Ligand SMILES: COc1cc(-c2cnc(N)c(-c3ccc(C(=O)O)c(C)c3)n2)cc(OC)c1OC
Ligand SMILES: [Cl-]
Ligand SMILES: [Cl-]
């Protein structure tokens with residue numbers, strides 16, 4: 001459980017620095033996240049430890065798996081070691097789709113829907129944006145922890161159905177390659193969100209898919225489908241789920 005056990009291959013992104021690493025013992029490819037607590041108080045660090053201990057708990061195929069936590073008092077740096085998702089995040093996929101003018105396959109959208117819904121179902125039992133949704137090597141979707149496009153109508157006033165809205169917005173952006181509600185100001189955005197109006201996703205996508213995404217974007221949280229009601233949907237099949 002020491003930083004010297006791992007070899008840094010290259011930096012992925014710059015919480016702090018994120019790096020792709022290889023464990024020397026077996027050569028397993030992973031990544032870690034650097035948190036410089038050097039400028040933190042004993043209070044902030046107290047929350048930092050107990051928060052990462054609760055990160056250690058979540059073991060689920062559709063949630064990014066956390067393996068280890070390495071402290072280095074030398075540079076006062078904390079390393080959270082997690083699984084490597086070779087496919088990157090959904091943000092890049094969406095960006096890649098915009099540029100190349102290609103819409104994502106409906107099969108892919110169903111995969112994200114199914115696996116992110118199972119991610120939420122898991123998070124709710126323990127009681128959301130493209131850049132926090134990752135893809136591994138085997139078509140698996142994994143969840144991982146400034147205009148608020150995905151903010152629900154009630155989340156600007158007053159709920160698990162709020163997550164369904166956020167998922168609704170994410171899936172919509174996967175289909176249309178843009179968020180359901182766009183605006184240059186947060187007050188404009190707020191305006192559009194309360195009106196609850198948006199375009200249909202591209203017509204290459206079936207009415208069935210459009211229907212469910214639309215239901216998730218319902219203004220009444222109680223009209224939105226529950227995690228259960230989503231998975232009962234005839235669209236969602238076994239091959240849309242995770243596979244090792
Ligand atoms: C942001 O862009 C990318 C991210 C990744 C990647 C792979 N595995 C990971 N575990 C993560 C990652 C990094 C940080 C965090 C976080 O807790 O903040 C998470 C949840 C995942 N990212 C891989 C990438 O390679 C394709 C990539 O594209 C350059
Ligand atoms: Cl396009
Ligand atoms: Cl398609």
Ligand SMILES: [Cl-]
Nearest residue numbers: 195196197198
């Ligand atoms: Cl309406």
Ligand SMILES: [Cl-]
Nearest residue numbers: 199200201202
């Ligand atoms: Cl359209």
